Tab-separated table of N, CA, C and O in Angstrom:
chain	number	residue	atom	x	y	z
L	1938	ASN	N	0.825	-1.148	-0.042
L	1938	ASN	CA	-0.167	-0.051	-0.018
L	1938	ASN	C	0.922	1.338	-0.164
L	1938	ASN	O	0.677	2.269	0.631
L	1939	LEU	N	1.946	1.149	-0.482
L	1939	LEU	CA	3.190	2.338	-0.722
L	1939	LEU	C	2.814	3.206	-1.727
L	1939	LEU	O	1.928	2.816	-2.806
L	1940	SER	N	3.214	4.321	-1.811
L	1940	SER	CA	3.433	5.487	-2.663
L	1940	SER	C	4.327	5.067	-3.450
L	1940	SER	O	5.148	3.879	-3.942
L	1941	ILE	N	4.488	6.091	-4.520
L	1941	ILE	CA	5.589	5.945	-5.355
L	1941	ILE	C	7.377	6.346	-5.066
L	1941	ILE	O	8.036	5.704	-5.729
L	1942	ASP	N	7.233	6.543	-3.730
L	1942	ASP	CA	8.223	6.734	-2.954
L	1942	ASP	C	8.742	5.942	-2.122
L	1942	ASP	O	9.665	5.675	-1.209
L	1943	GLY	N	7.908	4.957	-2.179
L	1943	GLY	CA	7.819	3.628	-1.113
L	1943	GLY	C	7.623	4.190	0.345
L	1943	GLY	O	7.467	3.293	1.010
L	1944	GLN	N	6.994	5.279	0.168
L	1944	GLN	CA	6.468	5.877	1.592
L	1944	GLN	C	5.169	5.307	1.980
L	1944	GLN	O	4.044	4.901	1.059
L	1945	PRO	N	4.560	4.669	3.088
L	1945	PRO	CA	3.281	4.071	3.487
L	1945	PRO	C	2.439	5.290	3.363
L	1945	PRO	O	2.282	6.383	3.996
L	1946	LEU	N	1.147	4.563	2.641
L	1946	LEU	CA	0.000	5.742	2.362
L	1946	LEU	C	-1.078	5.475	3.790
L	1946	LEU	O	-1.581	6.540	4.079
L	1947	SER	N	-0.437	4.268	4.402
L	1947	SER	CA	-1.296	4.220	5.891
L	1947	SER	C	-1.137	5.318	6.975
L	1947	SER	O	0.356	5.475	6.936
L	1948	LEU	N	-1.672	5.174	7.946
L	1948	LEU	CA	-1.218	5.976	9.318
L	1948	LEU	C	-0.607	4.869	10.042
L	1948	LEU	O	-1.135	3.464	9.915
L	1949	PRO	N	0.815	4.838	10.697
L	1949	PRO	CA	1.027	4.079	11.552
L	1949	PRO	C	0.455	3.253	12.471
L	1949	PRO	O	-0.679	4.060	13.058
L	1950	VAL	N	0.945	1.830	12.760
L	1950	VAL	CA	0.212	1.486	13.624
L	1950	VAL	C	0.500	1.602	14.841
L	1950	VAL	O	1.621	1.667	15.520
L	1951	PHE	N	-0.545	2.427	16.013
L	1951	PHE	CA	-0.094	3.360	17.162
L	1951	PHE	C	-0.227	2.204	17.999
L	1951	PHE	O	-0.842	0.988	17.946
L	1952	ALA	N	0.511	2.139	19.245
L	1952	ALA	CA	0.064	1.650	20.371
L	1952	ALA	C	0.599	2.325	21.534
L	1952	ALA	O	1.659	2.964	21.562
L	1953	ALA	N	-0.837	2.530	22.687
L	1953	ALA	CA	-0.359	3.309	23.674
L	1953	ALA	C	0.386	2.794	24.616
L	1953	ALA	O	-0.137	1.903	24.840
L	1954	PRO	N	1.163	3.665	25.337
L	1954	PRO	CA	2.059	2.972	26.638
L	1954	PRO	C	1.272	2.363	27.452
L	1954	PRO	O	0.164	3.193	28.103
L	1955	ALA	N	2.301	1.404	28.257
L	1955	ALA	CA	1.337	0.727	29.517
L	1955	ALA	C	1.547	1.996	30.552
L	1955	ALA	O	2.749	2.794	30.930
L	1956	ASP	N	0.690	2.049	31.424
L	1956	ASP	CA	0.719	2.975	32.892
L	1956	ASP	C	1.907	2.247	33.637
L	1956	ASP	O	1.831	1.278	33.678
L	1957	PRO	N	2.601	3.613	34.243
L	1957	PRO	CA	3.320	2.923	35.359
L	1957	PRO	C	2.843	2.016	36.624
L	1957	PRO	O	1.814	2.594	36.909
L	1958	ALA	N	3.219	0.702	37.212
L	1958	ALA	CA	2.809	0.061	38.053
L	1958	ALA	C	2.989	0.930	39.246
L	1958	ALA	O	3.911	1.473	39.649
L	1959	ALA	N	1.891	0.870	40.145
L	1959	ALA	CA	1.935	1.252	41.395
L	1959	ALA	C	2.970	0.300	42.565
L	1959	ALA	O	2.308	-0.854	42.562
L	1960	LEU	N	3.492	0.862	43.001
L	1960	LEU	CA	4.428	0.151	43.922
L	1960	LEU	C	3.694	-0.391	45.400
L	1960	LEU	O	2.903	0.667	45.647
L	1961	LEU	N	4.120	-1.862	45.818
L	1961	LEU	CA	3.161	-1.926	46.850
L	1961	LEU	C	4.119	-2.667	47.886
L	1961	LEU	O	4.898	-3.686	47.130
L	1962	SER	N	4.246	-2.803	49.058
L	1962	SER	CA	4.799	-3.429	49.629
L	1962	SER	C	4.243	-3.983	50.736
L	1962	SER	O	3.185	-4.088	51.088
L	1963	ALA	N	4.577	-5.045	51.672
L	1963	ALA	CA	3.958	-5.802	52.676
L	1963	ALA	C	3.906	-5.018	53.776
L	1963	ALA	O	4.897	-5.081	54.158
L	1964	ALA	N	2.966	-5.182	54.328
L	1964	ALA	CA	2.287	-4.397	55.765
L	1964	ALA	C	1.892	-5.400	56.573
L	1964	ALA	O	0.947	-5.668	56.204
L	1965	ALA	N	2.540	-5.626	58.034
L	1965	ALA	CA	1.766	-6.712	58.748
L	1965	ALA	C	1.708	-6.006	60.173
L	1965	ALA	O	3.072	-5.619	60.589
L	1966	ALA	N	0.863	-6.005	60.941
L	1966	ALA	CA	1.156	-5.736	62.000
L	1966	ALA	C	1.649	-6.949	63.124
L	1966	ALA	O	1.778	-7.815	62.611
L	1967	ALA	N	2.222	-6.340	64.194
L	1967	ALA	CA	3.444	-6.935	65.199
L	1967	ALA	C	2.342	-8.308	65.597
L	1967	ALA	O	1.530	-7.766	66.039
L	1968	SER	N	2.871	-9.196	65.672
L	1968	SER	CA	2.305	-10.347	66.712
L	1968	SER	C	2.985	-10.626	67.687
L	1968	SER	O	4.246	-10.743	67.528
L	1969	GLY	N	1.828	-10.881	69.258
L	1969	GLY	CA	3.101	-11.667	70.032
L	1969	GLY	C	2.301	-11.613	71.365
L	1969	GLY	O	1.306	-10.684	71.830
L	1970	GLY	N	2.431	-12.518	71.901
L	1970	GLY	CA	1.822	-13.359	73.149
L	1970	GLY	C	1.937	-12.593	74.493
L	1970	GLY	O	3.546	-12.137	74.469
L	1971	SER	N	1.422	-12.326	75.507
L	1971	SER	CA	1.656	-12.083	76.465
L	1971	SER	C	2.353	-12.764	77.581
L	1971	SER	O	2.576	-14.246	77.424
L	1972	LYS	N	2.813	-12.347	78.423
L	1972	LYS	CA	3.786	-13.361	79.242
L	1972	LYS	C	3.187	-13.637	80.421
L	1972	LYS	O	2.486	-12.714	81.165
L	1973	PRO	N	3.154	-14.912	80.877
L	1973	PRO	CA	2.326	-15.430	81.738
L	1973	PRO	C	3.089	-15.019	83.397
L	1973	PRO	O	4.326	-14.645	83.528
L	1974	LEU	N	2.329	-14.494	84.194
L	1974	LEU	CA	2.637	-14.192	85.868
L	1974	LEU	C	3.613	-15.028	86.352
L	1974	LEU	O	3.581	-16.536	86.208
L	1975	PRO	N	5.010	-14.824	87.133
L	1975	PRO	CA	5.831	-15.615	87.791
L	1975	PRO	C	4.769	-16.153	88.999
L	1975	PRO	O	3.577	-15.848	89.359
L	1976	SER	N	5.780	-17.214	89.711
L	1976	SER	CA	5.013	-18.169	90.805
L	1976	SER	C	5.213	-16.819	92.150
L	1976	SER	O	5.702	-16.355	91.849
L	1977	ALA	N	4.387	-17.733	92.666
L	1977	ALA	CA	4.207	-16.764	93.910
L	1977	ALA	C	4.884	-17.179	95.190
L	1977	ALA	O	5.519	-18.504	95.545
L	1978	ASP	N	5.452	-16.317	96.475
L	1978	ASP	CA	5.810	-17.288	97.628
L	1978	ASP	C	5.606	-15.970	98.606
L	1978	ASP	O	5.908	-14.672	98.054
L	1979	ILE	N	5.623	-15.975	99.644
L	1979	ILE	CA	5.054	-15.168	100.740
L	1979	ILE	C	6.208	-14.578	101.458
L	1979	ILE	O	7.564	-15.514	101.106
L	1980	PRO	N	6.421	-13.350	101.414
L	1980	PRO	CA	7.706	-12.664	101.841
L	1980	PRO	C	8.165	-12.958	103.082
L	1980	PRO	O	7.784	-13.320	103.840
L	1981	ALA	N	9.134	-11.567	103.535
L	1981	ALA	CA	9.667	-11.903	105.034
L	1981	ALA	C	9.005	-10.441	105.646
L	1981	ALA	O	8.732	-10.387	107.013
L	1982	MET	N	8.593	-9.262	104.840
L	1982	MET	CA	8.076	-7.864	105.144
L	1982	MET	C	6.623	-8.255	105.332
L	1982	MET	O	5.938	-8.920	104.228
L	1983	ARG	N	5.919	-7.208	105.750
L	1983	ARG	CA	4.705	-7.162	105.862
L	1983	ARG	C	4.151	-6.539	104.954
L	1983	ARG	O	5.028	-5.665	104.095
L	1984	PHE	N	2.567	-6.271	104.277
L	1984	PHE	CA	2.461	-5.634	103.446
L	1984	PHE	C	2.584	-4.247	103.437
L	1984	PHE	O	2.884	-3.721	102.268
L	1985	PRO	N	2.910	-3.063	104.767
L	1985	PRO	CA	2.720	-1.565	104.269
L	1985	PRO	C	4.382	-1.584	103.814
L	1985	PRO	O	4.777	-0.831	103.412
D	2277	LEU	N	20.495	-2.999	87.693
D	2277	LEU	CA	19.579	-4.798	87.371
D	2277	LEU	C	20.232	-5.291	88.215
D	2277	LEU	O	19.501	-6.450	88.550
D	2278	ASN	N	21.509	-5.760	88.316
D	2278	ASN	CA	22.110	-6.621	89.231
D	2278	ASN	C	22.254	-6.497	90.654
D	2278	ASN	O	21.960	-7.270	91.313
D	2279	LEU	N	21.895	-5.154	91.008
D	2279	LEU	CA	21.339	-4.768	92.425
D	2279	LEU	C	19.875	-5.209	92.854
D	2279	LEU	O	19.843	-5.785	93.854
D	2280	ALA	N	19.127	-5.276	91.812
D	2280	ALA	CA	17.787	-5.686	91.792
D	2280	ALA	C	17.597	-7.275	92.105
D	2280	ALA	O	16.980	-7.523	92.897
D	2281	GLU	N	18.635	-7.702	91.050
D	2281	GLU	CA	18.375	-9.123	91.148
D	2281	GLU	C	19.115	-9.511	92.626
D	2281	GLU	O	18.659	-10.525	92.957
D	2282	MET	N	20.327	-8.987	92.812
D	2282	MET	CA	20.469	-9.247	94.373
D	2282	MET	C	19.655	-9.047	95.591
D	2282	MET	O	19.322	-9.847	96.815
D	2283	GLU	N	19.083	-7.940	95.320
D	2283	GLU	CA	17.579	-7.230	96.018
D	2283	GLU	C	16.963	-8.726	96.195
D	2283	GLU	O	16.126	-8.762	97.399
D	2284	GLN	N	16.464	-9.257	95.327
D	2284	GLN	CA	15.136	-10.049	95.192
D	2284	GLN	C	15.874	-11.409	95.675
D	2284	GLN	O	15.112	-12.065	96.496
D	2285	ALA	N	16.856	-11.989	95.648
D	2285	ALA	CA	17.735	-12.983	96.241
D	2285	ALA	C	17.644	-12.691	97.500
D	2285	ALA	O	17.336	-13.703	98.425
D	2286	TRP	N	17.781	-11.551	98.283
D	2286	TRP	CA	17.825	-11.495	99.407
D	2286	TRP	C	16.672	-11.645	100.000
D	2286	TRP	O	16.151	-12.239	101.022
D	2287	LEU	N	15.488	-11.173	99.446
D	2287	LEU	CA	14.160	-11.371	100.107
D	2287	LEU	C	13.402	-12.593	99.692
D	2287	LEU	O	12.590	-12.701	100.393
D	2288	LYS	N	14.350	-13.357	98.954
D	2288	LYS	CA	13.587	-14.662	98.949
D	2288	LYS	C	14.526	-15.426	99.920
D	2288	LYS	O	14.094	-15.889	100.779
D	2289	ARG	N	15.562	-15.295	100.272
D	2289	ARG	CA	16.608	-16.033	101.269
D	2289	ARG	C	16.007	-15.049	102.426
D	2289	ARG	O	16.295	-15.761	103.918
D	2290	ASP	N	15.830	-13.790	103.009
D	2290	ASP	CA	15.564	-13.261	104.056
D	2290	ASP	C	14.242	-13.720	104.493
D	2290	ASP	O	13.214	-13.435	103.861
D	2291	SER	N	14.187	-14.375	105.852
D	2291	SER	CA	13.139	-14.461	106.292
D	2291	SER	C	13.301	-14.428	107.806
D	2291	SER	O	14.416	-13.648	108.650
D	2292	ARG	N	12.518	-14.865	108.871
D	2292	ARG	CA	12.578	-14.742	110.428
D	2292	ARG	C	13.498	-16.079	110.525
D	2292	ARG	O	13.820	-17.056	109.529
D	2293	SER	N	14.155	-15.962	111.586
D	2293	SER	CA	15.014	-16.772	112.315
D	2293	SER	C	15.399	-17.120	113.496
D	2293	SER	O	14.741	-15.701	114.354
D	2294	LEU	N	15.640	-18.184	114.303
D	2294	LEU	CA	15.980	-18.514	115.489
D	2294	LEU	C	17.048	-17.253	116.045
D	2294	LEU	O	18.008	-17.354	115.508
D	2295	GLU	N	16.749	-16.992	117.194
D	2295	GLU	CA	17.523	-16.263	117.846
D	2295	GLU	C	17.838	-16.821	119.489
D	2295	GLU	O	16.758	-16.856	120.209
D	2296	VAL	N	18.827	-17.392	119.859
D	2296	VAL	CA	19.190	-18.074	121.259
D	2296	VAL	C	20.736	-17.573	121.590
D	2296	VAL	O	21.472	-17.219	121.060
D	2297	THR	N	20.494	-17.284	123.061
D	2297	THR	CA	21.482	-16.916	123.691
D	2297	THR	C	22.173	-17.960	124.619
D	2297	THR	O	21.266	-18.585	124.933
D	2298	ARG	N	23.283	-17.913	124.935
D	2298	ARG	CA	24.249	-18.751	125.668
D	2298	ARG	C	24.832	-18.107	126.640
D	2298	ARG	O	25.838	-17.324	125.806
D	2299	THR	N	24.601	-18.591	127.886
D	2299	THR	CA	25.573	-17.952	128.908
D	2299	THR	C	26.779	-19.197	129.395
D	2299	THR	O	26.550	-19.965	129.536
D	2300	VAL	N	27.881	-18.547	129.430
D	2300	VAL	CA	29.137	-19.286	129.569
D	2300	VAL	C	29.858	-18.981	130.817
D	2300	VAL	O	30.135	-17.863	130.820
D	2301	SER	N	29.609	-19.904	131.790
D	2301	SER	CA	30.396	-19.297	132.810
D	2301	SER	C	31.742	-20.079	133.025
D	2301	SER	O	32.061	-21.404	132.654
D	2302	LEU	N	32.573	-19.626	132.177
D	2302	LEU	CA	33.927	-19.533	132.269
D	2302	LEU	C	34.856	-20.332	133.556
D	2302	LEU	O	35.759	-21.167	132.710
D	2303	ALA	N	34.549	-20.067	134.447
D	2303	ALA	CA	35.290	-21.048	136.002
D	2303	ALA	C	34.665	-22.453	135.571
D	2303	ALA	O	35.644	-23.262	136.099
D	2304	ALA	N	33.814	-23.295	135.245
D	2304	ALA	CA	33.608	-24.270	134.317
D	2304	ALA	C	34.012	-24.867	133.461
D	2304	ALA	O	35.031	-26.088	133.279
D	2305	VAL	N	34.531	-24.013	132.462
D	2305	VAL	CA	35.215	-24.568	131.097
D	2305	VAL	C	36.701	-24.534	131.712
D	2305	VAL	O	37.867	-25.282	131.074
D	2306	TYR	N	37.156	-23.358	132.405
D	2306	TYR	CA	38.787	-23.501	133.099
D	2306	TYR	C	38.782	-24.694	133.737
D	2306	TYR	O	39.881	-25.703	134.338
D	2307	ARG	N	38.048	-25.413	134.449
D	2307	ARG	CA	37.160	-26.268	135.589
D	2307	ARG	C	37.373	-27.899	134.746
D	2307	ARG	O	37.831	-28.839	135.078
D	2308	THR	N	37.292	-27.641	133.368
D	2308	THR	CA	37.718	-28.916	132.367
D	2308	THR	C	39.333	-29.413	132.298
D	2308	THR	O	39.360	-30.691	132.288
D	2309	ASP	N	39.803	-28.281	132.816
D	2309	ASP	CA	41.461	-28.796	132.945
D	2309	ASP	C	41.807	-29.005	134.204
D	2309	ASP	O	42.721	-28.895	134.887
D	2310	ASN	N	40.503	-28.495	134.895
D	2310	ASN	CA	40.482	-28.618	136.716
D	2310	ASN	C	41.796	-27.677	137.142
D	2310	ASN	O	42.390	-28.120	138.443
D	2311	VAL	N	42.100	-26.367	136.735
D	2311	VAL	CA	43.193	-25.796	136.805
D	2311	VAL	C	42.632	-24.431	137.096
D	2311	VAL	O	42.675	-23.287	136.544
D	2312	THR	N	41.285	-24.247	137.467
D	2312	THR	CA	40.255	-23.569	137.274
D	2312	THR	C	40.586	-22.260	137.820
D	2312	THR	O	41.798	-21.611	138.283
D	2313	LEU	N	39.497	-21.157	137.615
D	2313	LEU	CA	39.903	-19.652	137.587
D	2313	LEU	C	40.428	-19.037	138.965
D	2313	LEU	O	41.153	-18.226	138.909
D	2314	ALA	N	39.934	-19.576	139.659
D	2314	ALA	CA	40.013	-19.000	141.489
D	2314	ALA	C	41.114	-19.219	141.610
D	2314	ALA	O	41.652	-18.286	143.018
D	2315	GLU	N	41.925	-20.327	141.559
D	2315	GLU	CA	43.392	-20.027	141.720
D	2315	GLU	C	44.180	-19.878	140.358
D	2315	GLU	O	45.100	-19.436	140.407
D	2316	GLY	N	43.371	-20.154	139.122
D	2316	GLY	CA	44.208	-20.081	138.058
D	2316	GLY	C	44.738	-18.771	137.960
D	2316	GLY	O	45.837	-18.304	137.288
D	2317	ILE	N	43.958	-17.161	138.162
D	2317	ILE	CA	44.323	-16.100	138.247
D	2317	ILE	C	44.993	-15.955	139.216
D	2317	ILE	O	46.229	-15.163	139.211
D	2318	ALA	N	44.711	-16.474	140.411
D	2318	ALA	CA	44.901	-15.949	141.651
D	2318	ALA	C	46.858	-16.429	141.933
D	2318	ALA	O	47.655	-15.555	142.484
D	2319	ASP	N	47.222	-17.324	141.509
D	2319	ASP	CA	48.586	-17.869	141.400
D	2319	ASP	C	49.256	-16.970	140.870
D	2319	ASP	O	50.674	-17.403	140.862
D	2320	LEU	N	49.259	-16.471	139.686
D	2320	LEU	CA	49.381	-15.884	138.620
D	2320	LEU	C	50.777	-14.346	139.194
D	2320	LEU	O	49.452	-13.703	139.515
D	2321	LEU	N	51.423	-14.441	139.823
D	2321	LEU	CA	52.009	-13.235	140.093
D	2321	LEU	C	53.348	-13.371	139.500
D	2321	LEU	O	54.717	-14.038	140.205
D	2322	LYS	N	53.583	-12.559	138.514
D	2322	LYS	CA	54.985	-12.285	137.811
D	2322	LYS	C	55.264	-11.166	137.131
D	2322	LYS	O	54.056	-10.897	136.287
D	2323	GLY	N	56.190	-10.973	136.118
D	2323	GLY	CA	56.362	-9.898	135.418
D	2323	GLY	C	57.104	-10.781	134.032
D	2323	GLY	O	57.892	-10.065	133.549
D	2324	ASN	N	56.437	-11.800	133.941
D	2324	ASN	CA	57.104	-12.558	132.623
D	2324	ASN	C	56.568	-11.764	131.439
D	2324	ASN	O	55.590	-11.345	131.333
C-alpha cells in the first residue's frame, strides 16, 4: 500500500504505552503473646 | 539490674530466724582442765 517513493499511505500502527505500575509492599501488624505471671511465695516483710 | 537481682535474692533468702543466747560460766570451762579460775588467776604473780 505504498506510494511511488515507497512511503506508506497508511497511518502507522499506534500503540498507547502501559501505565506505570504502583509500587506496593507487605505491611503486617506485629504479633506477640503476653507473658504469664511468675510464681508466688510469701515474703518476710509485712504488707505496708 | 544486678542490684535488683541481688535484692530479690535477698528477699527470697531473708526470712525470720531463731535467736538463742547462751551464757558461759567460764569457771566451769577452766574446770575442764581442773586448774580453774579461782586459783588460776590468783597464783599468777610475775612480770614474765
